[PDB]
Each structure stands twice: as structure tokens, then as C-alpha cells.
């Protein structure tokens, strides 16, 4: 369980980002104890933000293996009377915290949040705070490194490390909050619907009250109970693009935590994909934490820029693609009304593209077990979110291979299980499946499908590509349920232009989507339409990627291509609601 | 034989080009008598031009078969007199063309020239010129279609059909001149070298006599005989970048014409190509008759902006890459002292990429006979150019395959027995021939590469891609012949910049020229240097090219990417000759 730190009467926080040392392992890093002693002969070094564009060559950019950063700490004695603890929001793959030069911590998974307690090692003075920060990525990671000394990734972007997200020190008493939950159950028969919100209070080292407000700091309602409720009639549904967050106050034993909360009901019925019982259209786009020269690190200014740009296309919802986004973007999604698809890192468990098969036991993948507690971590993080409305376990796992079915199952279940909502659960699958073949058919709520006719498929053919994606969606509806294309694209780069046009240039990138966008349209279970990508953003080289991934309706700051005013006039002309 | 039509006192000239009715055959015109009729429903076009891009939609640049040409053509009776001849400079493909609904012609070879005689159809008044143009390519076709209703090239350019070249009439006395033919021997031994040129008139249908001007007009020599001979002492030689041309009228039978000549001397010796009998040093690219939007139609302007560059850029050099140029480039080069390396229509003659191998003689290429008919057509057309140093039978064959040396072989005898000068023959080798595998090492006098260390060999690691072309080119030292780069470059996109680079942006590419570049320097036996290409141009649609070929120094407009200012330093500090 992990709540987001914030100032409350009852707790401080204090960050520690700013210009770190940072000093590259060259092999005998742990052998010499570099978390012992301040790193000598020192780079400098931003946190947060990822490591790999900030300096010049390929030898930052390119590392293999470990970097040390490294900062120095200091708490005032008479804090020590409260619980200090050290919250590392993300650490890009394995994590070592070293403190004085004991090892405090350890972390797998480079984009969830993990924390340690300093209570008993926080000395006092000035302590050496060390953070080693490893970039390999293998069959044992989630996202999956591939075999083809260097990183080479199973997956489309490049494979940015470093203190991706921030490094706070929080405090509480000794006796404190540690996971509130809140579900809401809906009666949209009264032509004045009202709720009632369960509590689920928990504490950890004593009477608990919770606080109920409205939008304006107006109380409202107040009850007592580590497991009470509470009734709220007329109530103000967040709604996309028409959010309304109540607030709660959870005062329990010296500590109080508040929360923002929005009151919505997520189910599918048939091929309709419901969002407050009305038949919801996504429009939108699959996204990517990229920013220059960040990195994957935090971006607060661009991610309001990136909803301010959402709202002006006249879009409502985006896929966390291929990793959790930072709980800030998750929370303003709330505040501003955006539907999103909170994915997990489980991206490259395919190894189709002796032949090893993705789910041998011996030599195929071995990301289960972390697969598992991904799906947890991510869930105990992010349920409260009235904008997640969906969970997707994978991004394009071999679906449709043998093994396939065995392992999702027991991970479709833990977050069937695990979600206190029941939000509907998916994986996006590959070009390559059909309805028949893959496993997600059976397992997944909504058919989610990333497909290319237009590109890899028939490009530049754009009759017979519209062929194939008649043919295949055709017969996804065979499966009586919710469809949405997760993604479509094209590379394009910004600037090439032409009337007859030709792959690549900003015309035939719009003709491409008004080709798919045709078909999407003649069936009813069709429930959304989201572009790859966002915007142009980094990935390995190979003579493929045109300097990076240049399927975006905008470059990689932000400037709209010709296809961003294509999209901004078709979704300003399609609701949220109705749409069918 | 074919000699440059020109304006004499004994022969006229009167172009035809400008805008001709066209036509798209329709499946349905030879059926209909459409070459009798004037067209119906026609479009305009101009010509000399390639038709693909002067239209807009897929349907003219994409078509696959006929288009008719047409146009009204009327000569003045007072001219029935002398001989009427019609000559099409270039009909890319197929070209057939009729005269008042009869055909007086039939040509195979999209890049060479052709005539016919109209004086006996030729009517009074108004008569119905047509030209029937085909565009398919097979492996009966130089270049080489390819397997994968569309033609797809075997060959990395897109595939430009049309009247290509212009089309003029021009008009002889009944006997004529029809082929003059001149070598040279000089005595460099005198430190004032003079030379011995060798005359050799052709008649057809009578006294001939020759006379020799210098630069200026000035007369210097004369004689009779239609295989006489000729002095000149203190000769003015010749030289790259340093052209003296001589003039050359013969006068016969009421018949003259007039010929530009540059004495100079080519021979290889060891591991030196000679010019002059001095140790030369190819600097320059290979290039592509392709400007926007003419398609491959000729461009006279363009053709002194593309040598302007050269000057200014410090080269010397250019090889007529996958086909022959038109013949005012070629004359050009002459005036302007630019060395060439022409090279024939035979491209795509490799299926590498049951298997049918590239000379299967049932299954696989068809172009032997029309291979020869090339050779001798073209070394006809140029052999009097003092630019022309060398001759290219092919580029990039499957040339280290089984029935490649017997494919060859004749092809190469066929050059070195029509060469009145007998200059170098080469042919260009693909990546994967070694000196042991590759046909090229015995039958060629100098071997030329085509290497992309870099980009698709070890691109993006420029260490990796050193050691590899180390290695290969070490080993082609060994056969103690010249060898020359004429091609090797990486795609890049004008305007993606970057100060660590990654592939496609301006910085990448220099370094990559820098990598070879080091490299090719450490080998006396490498003789020459020519980067591909001189500028962007159009290719066939697919996923690794970004809106055409972007492997230029230039951009398809000329203008410099960072890396023309490179060569432009580089070549400054390099010289003709001595560089070795
Ligand atoms: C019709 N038959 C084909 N089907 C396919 S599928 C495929 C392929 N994947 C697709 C899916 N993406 C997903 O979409 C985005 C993207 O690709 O840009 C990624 O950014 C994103 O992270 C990822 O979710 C990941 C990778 N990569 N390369 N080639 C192909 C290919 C090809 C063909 C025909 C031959 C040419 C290649
Ligand atoms: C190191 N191993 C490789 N070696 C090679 S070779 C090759 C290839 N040809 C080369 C040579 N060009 C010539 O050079 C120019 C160009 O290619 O731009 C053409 O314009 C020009 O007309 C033509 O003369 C014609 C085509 N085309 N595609 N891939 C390759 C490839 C690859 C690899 C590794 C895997 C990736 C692809
Ligand atoms: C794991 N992600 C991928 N998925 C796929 S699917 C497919 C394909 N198709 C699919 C449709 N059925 C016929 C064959 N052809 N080429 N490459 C691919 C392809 C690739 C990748 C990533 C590596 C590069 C190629
Ligand atoms: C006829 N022109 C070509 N020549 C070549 S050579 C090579 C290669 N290499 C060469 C070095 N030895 C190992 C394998 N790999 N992939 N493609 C190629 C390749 C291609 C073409 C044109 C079609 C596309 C690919």
C-alpha cells in the first residue's frame, strides 16, 4: 500500500531533487565501497529525470550496468520523535538504497513507488545518502530485455534510467494512516442519483473519524469507523471531461490524511463500454512518459501542456503505454476529467519477433512471478483513481502462442480479485491474432487491439489495407463485446509534404487515419479510437526509426502535425456519450 | 552509330519538344487503332519529360503498361530534297512509334538513343505523329523488374517512363556523314608532349576531308582520306578539371559536321589509375538523372547547377549511376573537365535478395542478349568523350554466384573490343563480395565498391563498422589492382540535428563519411572516393525509405546538408593528382 505523500497537520514533507553527485560503475564500483565514502572525481547530476540525454557521447547514453547517485541528508533532532521515512516515487529498474553505507532498501521495477523506514539509521549531522541505479533488462524484467555488452529492448522505446521520479522525506506518527480505500455504489434510478461510499480505514503502531467535504472545503457528512460508510444524495458524478472531486479528511490518532475522490460507475454490458450507465466513445491516444532532454523523468508543466493540448483536440482519454505514469499526471487526470488505461510494465513478453517459444519454462520468459506483484503494486496505488477505468495486464504479449493462456489467467484473477472497484480488465494485443487465436477473446472484458493496415499492413496500399481491416474487425465482433483500437499510426515526419502523397509525409499520414477511421465507423461495438502516438518520442537505433518513433500527431515538443488537425475537427464532431 | 545531332551548313535541326496530346492506354488502345486517329479525350504533356509526377493521384504515377504520346507534324516540301530522320534521344522502356497510323519504328532501352527515316512516309500537310510508351520491367527488362498489376524495380529508384530525352528532326544530304571516330597517341617523353590523333569517317548512300580547329577556331591542320590521320605538336591536354577541347570539321560530299575532341590518355598501372600518365584520385559521387518534377526527363539547367556544385565543392568526378546520361551531360563534362565513369542500364541483375538463382537460365535473368546490345550502343554513343575514363558493365550483380563470370565474360570482351580507346572495364560490386567470391577480380581492371559500413553493416556503431571495412578492404589489396569506393552513405534527413547523434540526422552522417573516410586512407591501392548520392531522389514506397532515397550530400533541390560542407573542406586539401 502506498499513499501519496502531501502536507498534512499531521505529516511534513520535505523533497530532496536538486543537483545530485552521480558518478558511472566502471565494474569495481561495490568492490570499493562507493556507498561508503562521497563519490570522488563526481558528475552532477538532476533528480528527477532520467540520466541518459543529460550529458554528451554515447557513454552516458549508451551505459551498461549501475550509476551511483549519491546526496547528503540531514533532519532536525526533534523530528525524530515522529516516523521518518524515505519514499522513492520511481527508480528506472533495481534500486539499492544506501545510508551511512548500509544497505536500507532494495527495489525491482523501475516505475512504481517503494519506500524505507530511517528511524533507526538516520544518524545524526550529515548522513551519505547513495542510491545505485541498474539499467540491465533481461527475460527476468519487466519490461523485457531482449538478446538482440549492451541493453537491447524487446520493446519500442528507448531505455531511459536514472531517479525517474522524485525522492521525498515524509513523516507521521508512530501510530498512522497507511491505505484508505473508497468504493461507490450508485442508484441512477432516482432522477436525482445519489450514493453511498463504503470507508475502509487502516492504521499500523485508537479512534478514527472521517471527514466528508465537497468541492469547495463545504463538510457535509462525518462518521467514525476503520470500516464505516456514508451516504451522500444529489450527488455530483465525475464525469469525462466534467470532473467533480469531493475531498475526505481520515482523522485517526494525531494523523489525518485527505483524498480526493470521484463518484463513477464503470461496466461493460454487450458491446457497449459504460461509464456512469451511458454508452462511453474513447478518443484519444496512447502516450508516452518522453520528454527532452528528461528523459522518462517527471514533466509537471508538460503533462499540463499535454492535457491542455487533449482538451483543445477535443479528446478524452489516453493509455498509460507500457509502464504506470507518475501519480501527479494520475491525479490531475482526476481533477481535469480524463478516462485513463492504466497499463503495467509488462511489455516484451513475446519472443515470436531452435526457435525458443515466448512461454518455455526453461529458456522463454521468466516474468511471472514480478508480473504478479506488478499488478498488485499498481492496483494498491492507483484504485481510488475515478479516471482509471480499466486495467490493461500486458502491452502485446505472445496472446495467441501455446503457454499463453496459463500465464494470464492467474494474473487476469489477481486483478480481477485485487481491484475493490472490479473495473473491467484487458490486454492489448499484437498485429497477428485473430478473435479464434487469442487468449484475450476468453480472459479480457474488452477486445483492445493495436493494428497497422496502412503501414506494416499494405502500406502504401490504402484499398487493400482497407480490406484486411474490414476482414479482421469483421469478425471480432463474432465475440459480442467492446472493441477499441489501442493503436493506429504512422510514422511521419513533420514537414514532408505532398499532394500526390507518399509514406511518411504529413499527408499520408491523414489519409491513413481517415482510411481507418472510415471502417471504425461501420460497427456499432467499436467503442473507441486511440492514435499511436501522442507524440514523437525516443527508442533504440535501427534503420527504422527515423530518429526515434515519429508516429505522434505532434513532434516531440509538442507542435501539431497536419493529422492533430484532422483528429481536433473529427473528435469536436463525436461525443463522449451516444456516440452509437 | 549515332552522332549528337547538331546545326550544320549541311544539316538542319528542328526540335519537337513541347506540350503533346497523351493519353493513358486503357487496356483498349492497340485493340482500337488510337496511333491512326487523333486522340480522343486527350491530356496535355510536355516533353521531353518523364509523365509521372506532372499529374496528381496514384493513377498517372502509378500506372502500370501504355500511354500514347501524340502529336501533329508537318515538314516544309523544299526539304523532301535531303534525307528526313527522326531521333528519339530516350523513350524510357519500350518505345513504338507511328507515323499517319503505320509503325516506322520499335525500340527496347529506356536510356539510349534511336532513329528512323521518314522520307517515304513522311506526307504532305498535317501528319499524325504517335508515340506508344511502355513501362513494364521484367527479367527481360535492363534495369530489372522484379517479382515484389504493378511493376516493382529490382532497383533502388523509382522507375520515371515517358519521353524521357527530347525528340528532334534533323535532315542530311543523301550521302552522309554517319559515324567519325578519333584516338590519340602522345609522347609524354618530350617535355613539350605533342600526340598523333587517328581519323576515321563513315559514309552512306565521293570525296571527305577533315580539318582541325583549335579552342578558338583558329584552323591548324588538314587532310582527305575516311581513315586518314593527323599531327599535333605542343597539344593542349585534355585535363580534370582543366578541359582543352579541339574542334573537328569534316567536310564530305556536300555533307559536314562538326566534332569536339580532348586528347588525353587513360592506363592503369598497378594499383594507379592513370590519367595522363599521372596517378589520379577519383573525388565525387554517383548520381541519379532525378529532379522534381521532371522525374528522370533531361534538365539542361539543373545539369549546370549540379556541376557549379561540383566545382565549388572540389570534385572531379561522377559515375552515370544505373543508366547512361543524356548526351548534352555528357558533352558538358567535356567542356567542364568533369571525369565519368558511365555505366549501362544493367541494375537489378541479382535475385539473391525453390530459391531461383540470378542466372538459373530457365527461371532466372533474361538479359544477356540485351545486355550486349547496351554495350555496344553505348560505348557507339560516347566513345570520342574525352570524360569517359572507364565503362561499367553492371551495377551491383549477383556477381559471386554461380553463371556470373559465364554471364559476364563475353559482356566484358564485347567492351574491351569495341572500345576504339580500350579503356578500363569495371563493374560495380554489392556488399557481400569478397576479392576470393567476386567475378569482378579477375575480369576488371579496377575494383569499385559499393560498402555501407555504418549504416546497413555495424550502423549505429561506427567501431564495430571501422574494424569490419578494415578487414574487408585489407583483403582487397591483395590483388594488387586500383581499387575505388563508388558508393557508400548513410540517409539523412535536412534539418534533424543533433549533438550526440543518432541515425538520419546531418551529425550522424558526417561522422560516418569520417569513419570511412580515415579508413580509405590508409590503403596507397584506393584510388578513388565517390559518395552516394550527390542528392536525394525518388525511389519505389517502402518502409525503410523516408519519402525517397535521403542518402544525398544535397537535398533533391540542391541544397547543402552539413555534410556537403565537409567534402567541400575534405576535397579542398586533396589533389587530382599525387594524392599517392
Ligand atoms: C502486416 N504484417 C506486419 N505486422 C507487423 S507488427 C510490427 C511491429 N510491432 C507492432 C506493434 N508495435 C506496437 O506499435 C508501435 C509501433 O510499432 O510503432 C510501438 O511503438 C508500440 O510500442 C507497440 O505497442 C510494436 C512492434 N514492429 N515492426 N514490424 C511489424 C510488422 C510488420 C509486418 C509486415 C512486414 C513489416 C513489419
Ligand atoms: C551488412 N549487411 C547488409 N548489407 C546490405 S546491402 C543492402 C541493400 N542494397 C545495397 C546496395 N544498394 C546500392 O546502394 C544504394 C542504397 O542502398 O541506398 C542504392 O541506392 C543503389 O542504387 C544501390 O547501388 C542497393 C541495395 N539494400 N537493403 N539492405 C541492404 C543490406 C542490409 C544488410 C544488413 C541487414 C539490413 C540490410
Ligand atoms: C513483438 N512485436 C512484433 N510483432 C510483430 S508481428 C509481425 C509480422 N506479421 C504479423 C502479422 N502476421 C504476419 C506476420 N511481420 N513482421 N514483423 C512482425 C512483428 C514484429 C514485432 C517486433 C519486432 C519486429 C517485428
Ligand atoms: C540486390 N541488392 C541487395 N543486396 C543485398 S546484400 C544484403 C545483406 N547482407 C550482405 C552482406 N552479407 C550478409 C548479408 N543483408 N540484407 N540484405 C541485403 C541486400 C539487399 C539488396 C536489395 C534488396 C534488399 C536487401
Redesign the pocket.
Same mark, same amino acid.
Given at each position: 500500500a502506498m499513499l501519496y505523500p502531501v502536507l498534512t497537520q499531521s505529516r511534513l514533507l520535505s523533497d530532496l531533487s536538486g543537483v545530485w553527485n552521480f558518478k558511472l560503475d566502471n565494474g569495481k564500483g561495490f568492490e570499493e565501497k562507493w556507498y561508503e565514502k562521497p563519490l570522488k572525481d563526481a558528475d552532477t547530476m538532476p533528480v528527477p529525470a532520467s540520466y541518459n540525454d543529460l550529458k554528451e557521447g554515447t557513454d552516458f547514453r549508451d551505459h551498461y550496468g549501475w550509476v551511483f547517485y549519491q546526496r547528503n541528508i540531514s533532519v532536525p533532532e526533534y523530528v525524530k520523535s515522529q516516523r521518518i521515512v524515505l519514499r522513492c516515487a520511481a527508480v528506472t529498474h533495481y534500486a539499492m538504497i544506501y545510508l551511512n553505507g548500509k544497505l536500507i532498501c532494495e527495489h525491482k521495477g523501475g516505475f512504481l513507488p517503494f519506500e524505507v523506514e530511517l528511524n533507526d539509521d538516520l544518524q545524526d549531522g550529515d548522513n551519505l545518502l547513495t542510491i545505485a541505479v541498474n539499467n540491465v533488462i533481461d527475460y527476468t524484467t519487466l519490461p523485457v530485455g531482449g538478446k538482440a555488452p549492451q541493453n537491447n529492448p524487446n520493446?519500442?522505446?528507448f531505455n531511459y534510467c536514472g531517479i525517474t521520479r522524485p525522492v521525498k522525506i515524509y513523516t507521521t506518527p508512530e501510530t498512522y494512516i497507511n491505505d484508505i480505500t473508497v468504493t461507490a455504489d450508485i442508484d441512477f434510478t432516482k432522477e436525482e442519483p445519489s450514493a453511498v461510499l463504503n470507508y475502509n480505514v487502516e492504521i499500523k503502531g485508537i479512534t478514527c473519524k472521517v471527514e466528508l467535504f465537497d468541492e469547495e472545503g463545504t463538510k457535509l457528512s462525518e462518521t467514525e469507523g476503520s470500516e464505516g460508510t456514508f451516504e451522500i444524495s444529489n450527488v455530483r458524478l465525475w464525469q469525462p471531461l466534467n470532473a467533480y472531486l469531493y475531498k475526505i479528511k481520515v482523522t485517526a490518532g494525531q494523523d489525518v490524511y485527505t483524498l480526493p475522490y470521484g463518484v463513477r460507475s464503470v461496466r461493460v454490458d454487450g458491446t457497449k463500454f459504460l461509464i456512469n450507465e451511458k454508452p462511453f466513445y474513447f478518443k484519444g491516444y496512447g502516450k508516452h512518459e518522453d520528454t527532452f532532454p528528461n528523459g522518462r523523468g517527471i514533466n509537471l508543466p508538460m503533462n499540463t501542456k499535454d492535457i491542455s493540448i487533449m482538451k483543445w483536440q477535443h479528446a478524452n482519454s489516453f493509455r498509460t503505454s507500457?509502464y504506470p505514469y507518475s501519480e501527479e499526471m494520475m491525479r490531475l487526470c482526476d481533477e481535469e476529467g480524463i478516462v485513463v488505461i492504466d497499463e503495467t510494465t509488462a $511489455?516484451g513478453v513475446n519472443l515470436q519477433f531452435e526457435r525458443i517459444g515466448t512461454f518455455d519454462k526453461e529458456h522463454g520468459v521468466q516474468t511471472q512471478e514480478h508480473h504478479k506483484d506488478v499488478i498488485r503494486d499498481l492496483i494498491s496505488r492507483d484504485k481510488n483513481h475515478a479516471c482509471v477505468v480499466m486495467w490493461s495486464i500486458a /502491452? #502485446?504479449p505472445d496472446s495467441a502462442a501455446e503457454g499463453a493462456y496459463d500465464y494470464f489467467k492467474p494474473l487476469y484473477d489477481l486483478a480481477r480479485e485485487l481491484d475493490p472497484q472490479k473495473r473491467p480488465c484487458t490486454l $492489448?494485443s $499484437?498485429?497477428?491474432t485473430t478473435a479464434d487465436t487469442d487468449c484475450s477473446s476468453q480472459l479480457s472484458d474488452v477486445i483492445c487491439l /493495436?493494428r *497497422?493496415y496502412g503501414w *506494416?499492413?499494405g502500406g502504401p496500399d490504402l484499398e487493400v489495407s482497407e480490406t484486411g481491416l474490414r476482414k479482421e474487425l469483421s469478425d471480432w465482433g463474432k465475440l459480442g463485446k467492446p472493441v477499441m483500437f489501442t #493503436?493506429y499510426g504512422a510514422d511521419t515526419v513533420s514537414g514532408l509534404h505532398d499532394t500526390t502523397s507518399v509514406m511518411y509525409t504529413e499527408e499520408y499520414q491523414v489519409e491513413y487515419y481517415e482510411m481507418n477511421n472510415k471502417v471504425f465507423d461501420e460497427f456499432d461495438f467499436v467503442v473507441g479510437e486511440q492514435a499511436? /502516438?501522442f507524440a514523437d518520442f525516443a527508442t533504440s537505433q535501427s534503420l527504422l526509426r527515423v530518429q526515434g /518513433?515519429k508516429?505522434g500527431l505532434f513532434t516531440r515538443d509538442r507542435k501539431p502535425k497536419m493529422v492533430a488537425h484532422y483528429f481536433r475537427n473529427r473528435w469536436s464532431a463525436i461525443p463522449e456519450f451516444g456516440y452509437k
Open positions: 520493446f519500442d522505446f507500457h $511489455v /502491452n #502485446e $492489448v $499484437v498485429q497477428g /493495436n *497497422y *506494416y499492413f #493503436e499511436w /502516438n /518513433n508516429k
